[PDB]
Design an enzyme around this catalytic site. Sequence first.
Site, PDB file in Angstrom:
ATOM      1  N   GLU A 137       1.018  40.579  -7.055  1.00  0.00           N
ATOM      2  CA  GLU A 137      -0.221  40.096  -7.584  1.00  0.00           C
ATOM      3  C   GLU A 137      -0.895  41.393  -7.724  1.00  0.00           C
ATOM      4  O   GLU A 137      -0.982  42.251  -6.765  1.00  0.00           O
ATOM      5  CB  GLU A 137      -0.951  39.408  -6.536  1.00  0.00           C
ATOM      6  CG  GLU A 137      -0.740  38.091  -6.700  1.00  0.00           C
ATOM      7  CD  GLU A 137      -0.980  37.229  -5.456  1.00  0.00           C
ATOM      8  OE1 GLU A 137      -2.005  37.342  -4.828  1.00  0.00           O
ATOM      9  OE2 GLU A 137      -0.414  36.243  -4.893  1.00  0.00           O
TER      10      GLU A 137
ATOM     11  N   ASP B 253      -4.171  38.746 -11.749  1.00  0.00           N
ATOM     12  CA  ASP B 253      -5.133  38.096 -10.854  1.00  0.00           C
ATOM     13  C   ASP B 253      -6.167  37.859 -11.700  1.00  0.00           C
ATOM     14  O   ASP B 253      -6.463  37.865 -12.615  1.00  0.00           O
ATOM     15  CB  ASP B 253      -5.327  38.535  -9.611  1.00  0.00           C
ATOM     16  CG  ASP B 253      -5.160  37.812  -8.415  1.00  0.00           C
ATOM     17  OD1 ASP B 253      -5.961  36.705  -8.221  1.00  0.00           O
ATOM     18  OD2 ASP B 253      -4.034  37.797  -7.516  1.00  0.00           O
TER      19      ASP B 253
ATOM     20  N   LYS C 108       1.072  40.299  -2.388  1.00  0.00           N
ATOM     21  CA  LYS C 108      -0.174  40.352  -2.723  1.00  0.00           C
ATOM     22  C   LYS C 108      -0.835  41.242  -1.692  1.00  0.00           C
ATOM     23  O   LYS C 108      -0.326  41.863  -0.678  1.00  0.00           O
ATOM     24  CB  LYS C 108      -0.814  38.818  -2.720  1.00  0.00           C
ATOM     25  CG  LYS C 108      -0.948  38.390  -1.292  1.00  0.00           C
ATOM     26  CD  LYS C 108      -1.485  37.006  -1.126  1.00  0.00           C
ATOM     27  CE  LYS C 108      -0.401  35.934  -1.756  1.00  0.00           C
ATOM     28  NZ  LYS C 108      -1.001  34.326  -1.666  1.00  0.00           N
TER      29      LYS C 108
ATOM     30  N   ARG D 142       0.736  -1.173   0.054  1.00  0.00           N
ATOM     31  CA  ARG D 142       0.069  -0.201   0.007  1.00  0.00           C
ATOM     32  C   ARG D 142       0.804   1.204  -0.079  1.00  0.00           C
ATOM     33  O   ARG D 142       0.365   2.100  -0.650  1.00  0.00           O
ATOM     34  CB  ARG D 142      -0.871   0.024   1.086  1.00  0.00           C
ATOM     35  CG  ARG D 142      -2.094   0.981   1.109  1.00  0.00           C
ATOM     36  CD  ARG D 142      -3.167   0.747   0.096  1.00  0.00           C
ATOM     37  NE  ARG D 142      -2.853   1.276  -1.237  1.00  0.00           N
ATOM     38  CZ  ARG D 142      -3.362   1.096  -2.209  1.00  0.00           C
ATOM     39  NH1 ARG D 142      -3.992  -0.024  -2.370  1.00  0.00           N
ATOM     40  NH2 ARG D 142      -3.169   1.870  -3.516  1.00  0.00           N
TER      41      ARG D 142
ATOM     42  N   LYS E  25      -0.105  26.082  -3.334  1.00  0.00           N
ATOM     43  CA  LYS E  25      -1.093  25.534  -2.246  1.00  0.00           C
ATOM     44  C   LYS E  25      -1.015  24.026  -2.494  1.00  0.00           C
ATOM     45  O   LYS E  25      -1.331  23.340  -3.742  1.00  0.00           O
ATOM     46  CB  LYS E  25      -2.463  25.894  -3.218  1.00  0.00           C
ATOM     47  CG  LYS E  25      -2.524  27.470  -3.479  1.00  0.00           C
ATOM     48  CD  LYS E  25      -3.819  27.839  -4.229  1.00  0.00           C
ATOM     49  CE  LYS E  25      -4.965  27.885  -3.494  1.00  0.00           C
ATOM     50  NZ  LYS E  25      -6.132  28.216  -4.303  1.00  0.00           N
TER      51      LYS E  25
HETATM   52  O1  LIG Z   1       2.785  31.772  -3.400  1.00  0.00           O
HETATM   53  C1  LIG Z   1       2.835  31.147  -4.612  1.00  0.00           C
HETATM   54  O2  LIG Z   1       3.959  30.462  -5.103  1.00  0.00           O
HETATM   55  C2  LIG Z   1       1.618  31.443  -5.504  1.00  0.00           C
HETATM   56  C3  LIG Z   1       1.754  31.295  -6.951  1.00  0.00           C
HETATM   57  C4  LIG Z   1       0.821  31.493  -7.958  1.00  0.00           C
HETATM   58  C5  LIG Z   1      -0.705  31.614  -7.427  1.00  0.00           C
HETATM   59  N1  LIG Z   1      -0.828  31.785  -5.871  1.00  0.00           N
HETATM   60  C6  LIG Z   1      -2.222  32.087  -5.434  1.00  0.00           C
HETATM   61  O3  LIG Z   1      -3.245  30.970  -5.961  1.00  0.00           O
HETATM   62  C7  LIG Z   1      -4.343  31.629  -6.491  1.00  0.00           C
HETATM   63  C8  LIG Z   1      -5.206  30.813  -7.759  1.00  0.00           C
HETATM   64  O4  LIG Z   1      -5.479  29.310  -7.253  1.00  0.00           O
HETATM   65  P1  LIG Z   1      -6.165  28.280  -8.192  1.00  0.00           P
HETATM   66  O5  LIG Z   1      -7.726  28.029  -7.917  1.00  0.00           O
HETATM   67  O6  LIG Z   1      -6.113  28.786  -9.568  1.00  0.00           O
HETATM   68  O7  LIG Z   1      -5.326  27.050  -8.249  1.00  0.00           O
HETATM   69  C9  LIG Z   1      -3.815  33.134  -7.128  1.00  0.00           C
HETATM   70  O8  LIG Z   1      -4.689  34.060  -7.861  1.00  0.00           O
HETATM   71  C10 LIG Z   1      -2.927  33.509  -5.816  1.00  0.00           C
HETATM   72  O9  LIG Z   1      -4.112  34.156  -4.906  1.00  0.00           O
HETATM   73  C11 LIG Z   1       0.087  31.727  -5.240  1.00  0.00           C
END
Ligand SMILES: O=C(O)c1ccc[n+]([C@@H]2O[C@H](COP(=O)([O-])O)[C@@H](O)[C@H]2O)c1
Lengths: 273, 273, 273, 273, 273, 273
Positions: free
Chosen positions: C188, C209, C158, C91, C126
């Site tokens: 951002e 954004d 941001k 697993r 994320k």
């Molecule tokens: O801190 C980073 O490496 C990072 C890099 C690129 C984007 N983000 C954040 O992730 C958001 C987008 O999420 P999603 O749903 O497109 O997967 C974006 O608009 C920011 O608020 C964060």
Amino acid sequence: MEIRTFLERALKEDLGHGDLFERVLEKDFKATAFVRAKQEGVFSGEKYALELLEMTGIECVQTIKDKERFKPKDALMEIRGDFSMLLKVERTLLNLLQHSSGIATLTSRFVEALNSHKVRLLDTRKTRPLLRIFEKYSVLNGGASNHRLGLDDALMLKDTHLRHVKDLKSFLTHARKNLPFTAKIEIECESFEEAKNAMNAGADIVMCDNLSVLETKEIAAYRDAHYPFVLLEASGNISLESINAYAKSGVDAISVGALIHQATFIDMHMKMA
Amino acid sequence: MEIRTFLERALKEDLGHGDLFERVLEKDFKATAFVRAKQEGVFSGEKYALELLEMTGIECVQTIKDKERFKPKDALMEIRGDFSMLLKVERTLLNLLQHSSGIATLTSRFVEALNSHKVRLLDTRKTRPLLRIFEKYSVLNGGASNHRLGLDDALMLKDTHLRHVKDLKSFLTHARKNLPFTAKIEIECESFEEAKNAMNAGADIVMCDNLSVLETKEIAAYRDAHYPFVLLEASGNISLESINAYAKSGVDAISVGALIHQATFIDMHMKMA
Amino acid sequence: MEIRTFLERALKEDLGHGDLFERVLEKDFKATAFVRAKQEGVFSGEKYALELLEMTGIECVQTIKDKERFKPKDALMEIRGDFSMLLKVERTLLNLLQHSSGIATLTSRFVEALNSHKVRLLDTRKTRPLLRIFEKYSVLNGGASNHRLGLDDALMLKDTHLRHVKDLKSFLTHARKNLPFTAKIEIECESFEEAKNAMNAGADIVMCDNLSVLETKEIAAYRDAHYPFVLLEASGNISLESINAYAKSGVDAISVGALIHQATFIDMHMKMA
Amino acid sequence: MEIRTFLERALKEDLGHGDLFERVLEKDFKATAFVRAKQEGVFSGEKYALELLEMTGIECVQTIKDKERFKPKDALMEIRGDFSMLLKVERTLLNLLQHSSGIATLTSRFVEALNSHKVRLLDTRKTRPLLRIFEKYSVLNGGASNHRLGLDDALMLKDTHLRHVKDLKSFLTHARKNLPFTAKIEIECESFEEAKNAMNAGADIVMCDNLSVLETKEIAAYRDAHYPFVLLEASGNISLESINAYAKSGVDAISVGALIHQATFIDMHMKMA
Amino acid sequence: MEIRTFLERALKEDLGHGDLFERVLEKDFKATAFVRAKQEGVFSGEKYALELLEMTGIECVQTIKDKERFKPKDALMEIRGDFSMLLKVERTLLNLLQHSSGIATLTSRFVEALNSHKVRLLDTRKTRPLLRIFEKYSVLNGGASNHRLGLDDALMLKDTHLRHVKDLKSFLTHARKNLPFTAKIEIECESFEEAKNAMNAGADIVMCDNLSVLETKEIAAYRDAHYPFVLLEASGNISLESINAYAKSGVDAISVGALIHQATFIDMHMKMA
Amino acid sequence: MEIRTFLERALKEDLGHGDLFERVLEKDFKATAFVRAKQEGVFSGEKYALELLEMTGIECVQTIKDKERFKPKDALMEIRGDFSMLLKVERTLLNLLQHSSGIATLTSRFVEALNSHKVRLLDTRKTRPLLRIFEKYSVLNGGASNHRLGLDDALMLKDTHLRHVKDLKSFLTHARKNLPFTAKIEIECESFEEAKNAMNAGADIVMCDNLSVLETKEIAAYRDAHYPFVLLEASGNISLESINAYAKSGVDAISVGALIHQATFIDMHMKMA
Ligand SMILES: O=C(O)c1ccc[n+]([C@@H]2O[C@H](COP(=O)([O-])O)[C@@H](O)[C@H]2O)c1
Ligand SMILES: O=C(O)c1ccc[n+]([C@@H]2O[C@H](COP(=O)([O-])O)[C@@H](O)[C@H]2O)c1
Ligand SMILES: O=C(O)c1ccc[n+]([C@@H]2O[C@H](COP(=O)([O-])O)[C@@H](O)[C@H]2O)c1
Ligand SMILES: O=C(O)c1ccc[n+]([C@@H]2O[C@H](COP(=O)([O-])O)[C@@H](O)[C@H]2O)c1
Ligand SMILES: O=C(O)c1ccc[n+]([C@@H]2O[C@H](COP(=O)([O-])O)[C@@H](O)[C@H]2O)c1
Ligand SMILES: O=C(O)c1ccc[n+]([C@@H]2O[C@H](COP(=O)([O-])O)[C@@H](O)[C@H]2O)c1
């Protein structure tokens, strides 16, 4: 391996998220490299270099044993392994090497400038954070002996501990039973009069903090006098020059911590091919 | 705390099986102590000292912020806690302090000897094992900036990597897609002719290894020429003296690793009362 | 090695006090087994898997390298070794091959719609706890490219960051001297006006954004005339349909972190045979 | 505690060499922040977060409990600590609340579409690496119930294990004396036949892997008939479009590992104010 | 702190994937409980226990310090804190208080027969794995004294060591320069002749192995005339009866390591009230 | 693996700063060694030793298996590695073979004096700190059988837990949905009354703590009568002078934790040759 992790850690702090070069590299192959020097001197840290290397999958074809002396443009190691891996280890190797080598050399120099075969060279707990051992080992591969390695190694005190005690002799006795059986009790002293209260009380060892030749000899004398089996330690500042003068104070060993906290690196580098 | 363990480890290597003094001590009480200096200089390692102290149950009554300057016989810290504990921490504190302070001072000196407000001072991955961070932080509290902290920090290469590549320009492009988006590509160069192939290919940064003023200016020139947004780095040996001369080569920053692997401790000690 | 301890912990958690079967197994024996698909997808995890196997003492007979494509009923790996160890590594092995390939697969489905050889696709920050690097790796085997990996890899600001900032242009200036030399700065921006400001203050990368295809093509254009040396990426709830469009809008790269937080396992299993 | 080391790690992976913004921030300060939802679902992770917060010296003003339902734009948490930190902790705190809540939610769906106050819904051992405990915990909040946690938890023999056991009734009997005293055994069966046997051998739980709702009924009967205290669990590729269907078959629990390996992040974000 | 991680691991092992009761406990509440004797003995473990408690968040109301004597039915500790945490820290708490006090108790029974204020009783290096320091601590709370703690604490040589040694006197000479300055050297001798040799070669401590009361009184006497500065200890299957005799035989100390490998738990338990 | 870290630790506690003899040894070399017994008993620890040996690069020539009986003067193991190491590893290897064998032996006594091929003999949770797994393992070899290993293993409610549960039949019913799917519950009872109740509530195992052989018979009956698949365990201060007595009472297992917390070292030693 007692130092297996030490290396483990040293490599990570540089690799962090992961080396960037390996991402770009297309076809990884097996190459070789040397560790030429660039400044004559001694060499320490073999042990580590060896461990690190096997730990990384790098073959150590040729090496120059520790305690050995070298001159610029000299090949100190013919290592061979994958190319990518070779570059990641490049730096972490040179570093630990240069640092160990450096303390070794600066220590070597203090050796000849001592000229003696009946007097010992010692260091101190004055070491860089996280290198208590890595360094003492270096102080060693120079020709000096190591003093205590820690605070569990041997109960050694000074004024700071006794500025609140009555009856020294009686003190060193209530310790013996509340200590480990194989532990000596060394004491620091700043004046003739102290060395006496010392020995008398029991003191397995007596140091001499910032005291001139004639100040010590009075003790080195009073020692050969009644208390013979009580080592004597010359420890104050002991410059590279005023060091030889103390060898003659007829004292067992002299501790010059400066051996460690004064040793810069030693030029070295790595070339492929 | 990202350095909480670092301290954790530094203390253990000295305590080993356990301090010997505490076994003998009969009645433990709460006393106080200072960290007088014994050689004018700067001061770094506050952050750590603070962490260590709270980590040990030692109150930090008075402290002298980092980046500050001091003169002998100066009180740098009024700490207070149990007596036994105070002595165990004594050494590990002075050590990390002296080492951080030392690199800070030796770095301070390189600052004034630079005299400039448009040129940056950088270090190198030339650091002592397990102190990649502890040191860079020190290089900082001197007045210099830090270069890359690791090999994941920013893809930076030299001949060794390209001694098997055809078409540089095309290379730095197949990397960009196989690297992290926010990573620059700095390149090492030993001759005028190189700096060109560099910039042209893309190189976000260009270094200058062991090259004389006039050798650099030709590049610093060809830079202000076509490729403006490409930082320039003077890095060779850069002695404490030949350092000022390069500030004038009209180059963004100069990296003198010697800042770290050349800094000895700085006298300090601890007294009770 | 860097992923040893990762794997090490992934095992420790499943075995707990220790496997129960090896307690009742009477005679252990060397057997062979294969990991097989049960659904189509792109393969990721080799790096991790081979290291798990060779770590536990299992021989690897055959393996589909990373990035490769595979149909259901396809045999993905052949492995030999002690029966008992195969059932323990089972697993732990599958689980990561699935979570890993699951991402990569769902990633190529995007790399598709994207459809371009000038625009890069990027993940984000994320990620699931403890799998930052793991997951980032996967995204690579999905055909795309990784953004930064941490808060040390590069500075990014941001709204939350700026709300406590006066005169930005002056900020990104007296910042470069406290940031590591190679560090890029990205911002951002939620509008054209914000965009201009950023670029001007001296930003290295501007993030477009939640902005309409248009507003981008415009923050784009503006950039191809006043600041050609700035990186531009578009982000914000981008999907499999709308993703195509942005590609064609003169924008450096696109970051749809969903490629990770929206990827699930890809049914696989292991059979003895 | 227990999970302090999990969080300790989740952070160290993002911080790396160290947070950059904290280098350029001028004057840190106390501040508040809210975690708002951008999707409706069920809240999981409370347990973890509260430790992440206290662990990094942040104050928790207000927080919803685990299992509580939430609508978008809903303010879920009110945290208050140093601006600098709040930032380092941000993504982590969110990443884990999104992963945890993500799972609980999808789970809560199966629990509703299951409909029954007497049939348990179970997860599995198919989990993401290093999150075994975390993800089980998540499923819990979604309103379902955990199966065993590892291989020490209880013994389960699938076909693989059995394919070498001549005479099962004995094997189970002569295994009890080895396995810890308080352990249950569970055998995977694929026919009314196997289940009829497995039960006499003395299994403590019988897996009705991939069978018709009819066969399952059959076994559930034989169970209620000759072996009452046996325990039935139906498993296999099961989906919302068939849960309620199996719930009404006599089995004591339906097992669907899709609850975790198919769950995704529920959109959430952090605001200052 | 040094015993944090010890306790930390002692807990981790018992909880495993996590306590099950806290899963079914409906309303947790603050309650008080006491640890109580059920047999007479001498108390050891305070140091460890208080650290466990204050570590888990349990308040300590009252505690019998170490070395104290206690009869059955006696209340040894009063503790308050969350019900749930009390039941988790329960066995972990008791277990070490028992194993610890069990040793100490069985130790005083020896310190008795010994009956002397000039002869020290010592443990050995024969301890249960991972409890060297723990157990050594206990022996102290038993009324005796500890021998060395490791193979770094002091050099000790026995048959196995010597079998590959020519001219001992010459050995202990060219050894002092490779051993840490404070290090004592001790030798195991199985006869008078061996004894003399040792002392002469320059041994610091001689061990009188399996030798008759007489042969000791003799290796003793010889020592009170030719080498008064040598330590002598007797060892080898010493028991509660024969131990008395040796005391009166002019021998420095006696080491009956049985004080540990022959000590068992001292029935204790915890009640809520 | 699993226990590699246990041994890794057991060594690090004895070596400390480092082995001394290895500093003064002149020329290391390969050599053999045997572990001879000096007491008759039963051999346990094989599992551990073989890892300790391989782990430290020592070769195992020959070794007896776990559970094998041995007489004094019997040669138990033939190891072969570098002289220096064999020495560092010596005490550890012996310490753990003596502790492990010690337990197995005392255990093997209870198994003989128990006499019965249908009644299991069980240990407990009363174990020495950091050896939970080790000691259980030991009991195993002595010929007995382990109870649960920790608090995650299975749920057990003693009086303490119950003293707050109005209506137990429900509590057990409304706890199943929380505890993992494969967990048994065990309730401690002190009267035929409690056991009659506990069983209806639906306990899975009933502890017959401190009861007459008559009461036990009573419960064993009621068990064979109305609740067949329940499982009975008799416990309390039980000793050789009463085991056989309880074996013949219907209970499925007798529980005696004295097997471990009362076991001691079996004399053993290491010779070179
Ligand atoms: O801190 C980073 O490496 C990072 C890099 C690129 C984007 N983000 C954040 O992730 C958001 C987008 O999420 P999603 O749903 O497109 O997967 C974006 O608009 C920011 O608020 C964060
Ligand atoms: O405890 C130790 O390891 C230790 C061993 C030998 C010397 N010292 C201290 O180190 C001092 C000398 O330092 P230095 O480098 O200026 O020669 C000495 O006089 C003591 O106060 C400390
Ligand atoms: O990768 C790094 O961190 C790094 C950053 C800046 C410089 N270096 C190397 O360090 C060299 C200079 O060392 P130094 O102390 O003699 O000035 C330089 O020319 C390179 O070969 C390495
Ligand atoms: O190891 C476990 O705890 C475990 C418990 C119940 C079922 N399984 C396996 O998981 C399979 C179903 O996969 P899924 O899509 O419902 O996650 C099932 O038929 C078995 O082969 C595994
Ligand atoms: O290495 C040590 O610290 C050490 C110190 C004192 C004694 N020993 C050994 O322990 C032996 C006695 O064991 P016992 O039965 O008296 O507990 C003794 O004769 C040596 O072979 C070992
Ligand atoms: O926690 C366990 O696994 C456990 C299992 C069975 C019994 N006990 C407890 O151990 C007690 C008997 O102690 P002893 O001398 O036989 O080790 C018994 O009556 C309970 O209070 C504890």
